Design a protein around this ligand. Sequence first.
Ligand SMILES: CCCCCCCCO[C@@H]1O[C@H](CO)[C@@H](O)[C@H](O)[C@@H]1O
Ligand SMILES: CCCCCCCCO[C@@H]1O[C@H](CO)[C@@H](O)[C@H](O)[C@@H]1O
Ligand SMILES: CCCCCCCCO[C@@H]1O[C@H](CO)[C@@H](O)[C@H](O)[C@@H]1O
Ligand SMILES: CCCCCCCCO[C@@H]1O[C@H](CO)[C@@H](O)[C@H](O)[C@@H]1O
Ligand SMILES: CCCCCCCCO[C@@H]1O[C@H](CO)[C@@H](O)[C@H](O)[C@@H]1O
Ligand SMILES: CCCCCCCCO[C@@H]1O[C@H](CO)[C@@H](O)[C@H](O)[C@@H]1O
Ligand SMILES: CCCCCCCCO[C@@H]1O[C@H](CO)[C@@H](O)[C@H](O)[C@@H]1O
Ligand SMILES: CCCCCCCCO[C@@H]1O[C@H](CO)[C@@H](O)[C@H](O)[C@@H]1O
Ligand SMILES: CCCCCCCCO[C@@H]1O[C@H](CO)[C@@H](O)[C@H](O)[C@@H]1O
Ligand SMILES: CCCCCCCCO[C@@H]1O[C@H](CO)[C@@H](O)[C@H](O)[C@@H]1O
Ligand SMILES: CCCCCCCCO[C@@H]1O[C@H](CO)[C@@H](O)[C@H](O)[C@@H]1O
Ligand SMILES: CCCCCCCCO[C@@H]1O[C@H](CO)[C@@H](O)[C@H](O)[C@@H]1O
Ligand SMILES: CCCCCCCCO[C@@H]1O[C@H](CO)[C@@H](O)[C@H](O)[C@@H]1O
Ligand SMILES: CCCCCCCCO[C@@H]1O[C@H](CO)[C@@H](O)[C@H](O)[C@@H]1O
Ligand SMILES: N[C@@H](Cc1c[nH]c2ccccc12)C(=O)O
Ligand SMILES: N[C@@H](Cc1c[nH]c2ccccc12)C(=O)O
Ligand SMILES: N[C@@H](Cc1c[nH]c2ccccc12)C(=O)O
Ligand SMILES: N[C@@H](Cc1c[nH]c2ccccc12)C(=O)O
Ligand SMILES: N[C@@H](Cc1c[nH]c2ccccc12)C(=O)O
Ligand SMILES: N[C@@H](Cc1c[nH]c2ccccc12)C(=O)O
Ligand SMILES: N[C@@H](Cc1c[nH]c2ccccc12)C(=O)O
Ligand SMILES: N[C@@H](Cc1c[nH]c2ccccc12)C(=O)O
Ligand SMILES: CCCCCCCCCCCCCC
Ligand SMILES: CCCCCCCCCCCCCC
Ligand code: NA
Ligand code: NA
Ligand code: NA
Ligand code: NA
Lengths: 504, 504
Amino acid sequence: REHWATRLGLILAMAGNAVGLGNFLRFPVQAAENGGGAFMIPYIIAFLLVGIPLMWIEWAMGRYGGAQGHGTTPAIFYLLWRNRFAKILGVFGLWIPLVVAIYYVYIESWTLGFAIKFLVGLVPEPPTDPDSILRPFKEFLYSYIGVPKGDEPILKPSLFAYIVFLITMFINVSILIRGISKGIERFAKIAMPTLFILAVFLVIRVFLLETPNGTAADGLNFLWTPDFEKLKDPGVWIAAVGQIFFTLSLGFGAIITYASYVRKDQDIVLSGLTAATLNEKAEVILGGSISIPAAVAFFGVANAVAIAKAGAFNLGFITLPAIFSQTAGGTFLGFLWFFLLFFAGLTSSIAIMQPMIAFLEDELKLSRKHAVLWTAAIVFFSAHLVMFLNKSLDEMDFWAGTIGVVFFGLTELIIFFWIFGADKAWEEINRGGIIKVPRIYYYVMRYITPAFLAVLLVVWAREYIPKIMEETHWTVWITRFYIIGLFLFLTFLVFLAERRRNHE
Amino acid sequence: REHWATRLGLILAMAGNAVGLGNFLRFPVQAAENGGGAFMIPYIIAFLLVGIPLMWIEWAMGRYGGAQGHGTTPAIFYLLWRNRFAKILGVFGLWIPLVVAIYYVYIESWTLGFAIKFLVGLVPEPPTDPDSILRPFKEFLYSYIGVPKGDEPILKPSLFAYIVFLITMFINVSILIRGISKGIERFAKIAMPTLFILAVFLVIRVFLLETPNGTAADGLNFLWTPDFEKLKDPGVWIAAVGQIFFTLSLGFGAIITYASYVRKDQDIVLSGLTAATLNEKAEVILGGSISIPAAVAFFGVANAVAIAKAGAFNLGFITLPAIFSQTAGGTFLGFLWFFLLFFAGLTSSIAIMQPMIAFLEDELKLSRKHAVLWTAAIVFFSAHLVMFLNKSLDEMDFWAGTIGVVFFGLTELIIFFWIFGADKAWEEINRGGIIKVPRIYYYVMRYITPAFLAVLLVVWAREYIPKIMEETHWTVWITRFYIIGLFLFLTFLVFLAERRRNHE
Ligand SMILES: CCCCCCCCO[C@@H]1O[C@H](CO)[C@@H](O)[C@H](O)[C@@H]1O
Ligand SMILES: CCCCCCCCO[C@@H]1O[C@H](CO)[C@@H](O)[C@H](O)[C@@H]1O
Ligand SMILES: CCCCCCCCO[C@@H]1O[C@H](CO)[C@@H](O)[C@H](O)[C@@H]1O
Ligand SMILES: CCCCCCCCO[C@@H]1O[C@H](CO)[C@@H](O)[C@H](O)[C@@H]1O
Ligand SMILES: CCCCCCCCO[C@@H]1O[C@H](CO)[C@@H](O)[C@H](O)[C@@H]1O
Ligand SMILES: CCCCCCCCO[C@@H]1O[C@H](CO)[C@@H](O)[C@H](O)[C@@H]1O
Ligand SMILES: CCCCCCCCO[C@@H]1O[C@H](CO)[C@@H](O)[C@H](O)[C@@H]1O
Ligand SMILES: CCCCCCCCO[C@@H]1O[C@H](CO)[C@@H](O)[C@H](O)[C@@H]1O
Ligand SMILES: CCCCCCCCO[C@@H]1O[C@H](CO)[C@@H](O)[C@H](O)[C@@H]1O
Ligand SMILES: CCCCCCCCO[C@@H]1O[C@H](CO)[C@@H](O)[C@H](O)[C@@H]1O
Ligand SMILES: CCCCCCCCO[C@@H]1O[C@H](CO)[C@@H](O)[C@H](O)[C@@H]1O
Ligand SMILES: CCCCCCCCO[C@@H]1O[C@H](CO)[C@@H](O)[C@H](O)[C@@H]1O
Ligand SMILES: CCCCCCCCO[C@@H]1O[C@H](CO)[C@@H](O)[C@H](O)[C@@H]1O
Ligand SMILES: CCCCCCCCO[C@@H]1O[C@H](CO)[C@@H](O)[C@H](O)[C@@H]1O
Ligand SMILES: N[C@@H](Cc1c[nH]c2ccccc12)C(=O)O
Ligand SMILES: N[C@@H](Cc1c[nH]c2ccccc12)C(=O)O
Ligand SMILES: N[C@@H](Cc1c[nH]c2ccccc12)C(=O)O
Ligand SMILES: N[C@@H](Cc1c[nH]c2ccccc12)C(=O)O
Ligand SMILES: N[C@@H](Cc1c[nH]c2ccccc12)C(=O)O
Ligand SMILES: N[C@@H](Cc1c[nH]c2ccccc12)C(=O)O
Ligand SMILES: N[C@@H](Cc1c[nH]c2ccccc12)C(=O)O
Ligand SMILES: N[C@@H](Cc1c[nH]c2ccccc12)C(=O)O
Ligand SMILES: CCCCCCCCCCCCCC
Ligand SMILES: CCCCCCCCCCCCCC
Ligand code: NA
Ligand code: NA
Ligand code: NA
Ligand code: NA
């Protein structure tokens, strides 16, 4: 089996899996909407009670499977629970990252396309008032993605956008096809420092911004002043737990597969902790310091709230571009910003594609080249639904990317700490640990973490699924049909894997 | 390898593959529209110059592949032409019957649902004038299939319709899962005589029909009086060649796979000829005598033309039901009519599903039970697009079922008689023949048949594809996407097959 070459490379790859667009766009928007500085209360709590515990568990599951030649959950789940239903639940854990890859690489491609456009200065140039600066950037984005101009939910990406998607897939493939140590690890070692450098440069540049409407300080102010009254609200705790889940990429399958290239007794306790901490620093220190402070410096605390409510995507792809178009050196700054996002996405998309690659390798015994190419083929083909059908992305992100991962995380907790055995689980996590998990986490993992996740899944799912099932356009069924198809396809491959195994 | 048990069973199964709804609905409509009695000119010509020749070729290809353990075209094409592109063209020949199965079994289910409804008398009862009798039957059908009432191209089959689809799949599976001799062959031996009996009873009953508007004789009159002027028209020759292709099920893959269970030196010349002749008798004698004569007896030669133009589907599923609702014993007659159609479809759907079954068996070494069940799973799942998306059926029938098969037939001609070798082809067809193919067919096969097909593909494709590509609703892309996906899926399975082979 492939293995990480260095401790540092492992950790930077795992950190790269976690550090994505969310660090710089989602966290700051969720913190601003869910109590500002107060949000660090439920956020730090979620980190300690859900994020850390589940992260170690996923590392443990992957290292465990890896020792037996298995990096994906159909096989691993079955190893933890020798039952046909385990294999099936396991399929769900491979379907998630496949479906996510199918929209995420396209999202990633947009950051590359915008970096290129911003680098060469092929961007809009306004001219006044807020909407007069935003609209040209909204149009710029809408033209790139091909947002429907009419009543058909059909998208039409620009040719440039499509070609950039091809290039982005190519770049992912170039990395992946070199494998774990010479591809992913090697890339992480360049990518994480680059990312760090860009983010710091960005934070500095941002902190200098002054306009008649305000300064970067005003932005930090608005972002971080506590609103302790929002803690009363239950949706703030859901937001925090969800933000932790998303930021650490839990339940998505990448951690498990990456951890499957960690050696049998090689530490995961400290390595996992260190990768999580890197993500948290990039998230709260860097991400907390760029996008919102810029937007508030430029638009002023007067529009802070409306800006936060308009969301992470508008913030990263319309509002900041616009702000860059109005500040000194801003076009080049825009390139730096999108370059940052691109490496942030790229370090995660290689991670999210590796599980399908591992599966084909481990279970169907494809060569790495064939596994990477067929995985790229499936993702590339599939992504055409996402590129051309409006809201397809959203439906995949919901069922696989959201409901899916949280339910799957809960499943991970139960299979590992309850079915496999709480004491076996504990020993599996701690074996070879450079440091040991505090004994108190045994109870957190067995009782607290699953309870938490059970609430996130439940209290929340009641408040989401009915809307998605009832208030959506009929075309959602197209995406549902297709991804259910993908689930059936994976079930079939697992069936073939087990037939191939019985033969040999 | 499985083999047919009896000569008779082989022939009745192959005849059952050919004899379908077309015999009783399409042929009579095409003959009435393309010269009446005159139509037998280009029709008999097509039979001799395209239908017979290509049929023998497909039998020869399947028997040939069968001797080497291969019943489907990815493997067989490669055996005839050891080139990667051969395998790929071969994939197309397995994709066709998979896609066709995916809509055809649903069409079949409708005949079963209507037979049941008509048997128990749960049908509409009009009351006057033509539309006043038809409309309740149009509505009856529209309610069953769930034709869109609004502007969304969404279908909503009745629950009854859906359940009947489940039953129909079950019935197909029950037959298929018993395999070639104990399932398909055994069923053919009951089904073909039953079919013959129903058709004869129907012809007799129909010939007795008298109304103030006319008699069955008037119907035969209108149907068979020649219009030799239409032969001038090129589209009449296309219609005839196409009708022959469709009636004999050529290019669809079922003949090749069925023939793969014929023993290495067991005759195919006379057996193939005999199965074709059975289809022709059922088509021109029986099919020519029922549907149109009934419709004209009842509605009168005054509306003969308009009725023919309204098409085979309206004829079989609306107009005849209605006519049955106005004649003595007509409800029970309606049951007999739909029972006839059901067995006609059922004997063909088992044939069209066998290629995917053979592939999984021959190439992935699945057991017959697993191959049948997974094939049923894929067809069942896939059919939901056909059941719920308006015009999906039509798009599949076009690309796979129409363009597909004719192009594939041409491909068969070229690979066999040109690439494999015209003399090797000839010997392959004739080996073990009870009778020998007339020497003159050597030239027909090498020059005439491919020319014919090249024209059907070309002259016609110019006149069809632009309309389908330009004048269709955007939702066609959903079906295109999906069936291209199916093509990619099959390519992947072939890839796995060849990897499994290299390993063993
Ligand atoms: C290989 C998968 C086939 C599915 C059909 C998708 C073909 C993509 O088509 C492409 O779309 C681009 C972006 O809209 C256009 O700019 C280009 O003209 C190109 O035709
Ligand atoms: C490395 C230098 C090459 C970069 C050139 C590729 C970008 C060209 O992109 C162009 O941008 C224009 C302005 O937004 C658009 O109007 C055009 O549709 C086009 O996509
Ligand atoms: C390095 C990647 C950047 C190169 C991608 C450039 C492709 C965009 O080229 C585009 O072609 C379209 C069709 O002719 C034009 O309408 C656009 O204006 C644009 O020039
Ligand atoms: C993006 C890379 C080049 C940008 C370099 C310009 C950084 C200086 O930035 C400037 O700082 C001034 C105070 O010193 C402020 O009044 C202005 O907001 C201005 O942006
Ligand atoms: C969901 C799978 C993607 C399907 C949509 C991508 C291809 C759409 O392409 C479409 O083709 C039509 C017919 O040639 C053209 O008339 C349209 O302009 C459009 O380019
Ligand atoms: C079982 C899944 C629990 C998820 C809890 C946190 C999810 C909150 O994220 C939510 O996702 C929704 C659907 O994707 C979006 O429409 C909302 O805007 C929101 O961001
Ligand atoms: C490709 C075939 C699509 C058929 C879709 C038929 C079902 C239409 O139902 C649709 O379902 C949505 C999602 O639950 C709901 O928001 C609405 O009820 C909508 O009408
Ligand atoms: C197993 C494949 C899942 C795809 C969703 C299709 C579920 C079919 O749903 C069924 O449709 C019938 C016919 O319209 C309805 O009468 C029934 O209520 C039933 O819900
Ligand atoms: C073997 C006896 C059982 C046959 C009963 C099943 C048929 C019931 O079918 C019924 O037909 C009605 C009249 O068309 C419809 O209005 C109902 O929706 C229903 O589908
Ligand atoms: C042997 C196969 C025939 C049995 C199928 C009968 C299923 C149709 O049953 C249907 O249920 C619907 C939902 O409650 C009703 O609206 C219809 O009127 C009908 O009764
Ligand atoms: C469908 C099975 C039962 C049908 C039996 C009735 C057959 C007799 O049919 C009758 O023949 C008469 C002349 O003899 C005609 O005038 C009428 O059209 C009538 O249909
Ligand atoms: C192309 C794959 C088939 C998808 C369509 C079959 C399922 C459509 O079912 C739909 O579900 C909606 C949400 O629950 C309901 O509101 C609608 O009434 C409808 O039944
Ligand atoms: C390469 C394929 C050649 C086909 C020649 C005969 C086909 C004539 O059949 C045609 O099929 C069309 C599309 O399915 C239908 O829309 C027309 O009504 C017509 O029946
Ligand atoms: C599921 C995603 C569907 C995206 C479809 C986008 C292409 C829309 O183009 C469509 O193509 C049809 C067939 O060629 C043509 O009849 C029309 O040009 C139609 O507009
Ligand atoms: N961790 C990423 C988000 C993420 C979760 N799961 C993923 C899977 C693939 C790519 C990204 C992700 C971020 O904070 O931005
Ligand atoms: N219109 C912005 C949000 C917004 C509202 N008011 C503002 C004032 C300033 C800047 C942005 C805003 C968007 O949807 O993306
Ligand atoms: N659906 C979320 C993003 C997301 C994906 N997976 C998640 C898991 C947990 C929380 C959020 C997410 C959004 O659109 O904002
Ligand atoms: N568990 C110890 C020692 C160890 C065991 N196997 C390893 C493989 C690689 C590196 C270290 C180790 C550690 O991680 O440090
Ligand atoms: N031979 C059938 C039509 C047909 C052609 N190919 C098929 C494939 C499956 C089922 C039926 C068919 C008929 O005349 O009615
Ligand atoms: N309206 C019938 C065809 C038709 C036209 N005129 C007629 C007169 C009598 C019977 C049928 C017809 C259909 O579309 O199905
Ligand atoms: N598409 C034809 C039926 C058909 C399917 N395959 C064919 C091959 C040849 C001729 C006709 C067909 C129709 O709707 O009428
Ligand atoms: N070719 C001869 C004899 C023959 C060879 N192999 C066979 C297998 C089965 C039946 C007959 C045969 C025939 O078909 O009659
Ligand atoms: C697995 C990734 C899901 C995407 C969630 C959003 C992340 C924050 C940046 C906004 C851009 C995303 C486009 C919908
Ligand atoms: C392979 C079968 C294709 C269907 C062609 C039509 C056959 C004649 C009867 C009409 C009913 C079919 C519903 C579209
Ligand atoms: Na993160
Ligand atoms: Na990343
Ligand atoms: Na036929
Ligand atoms: Na048949």
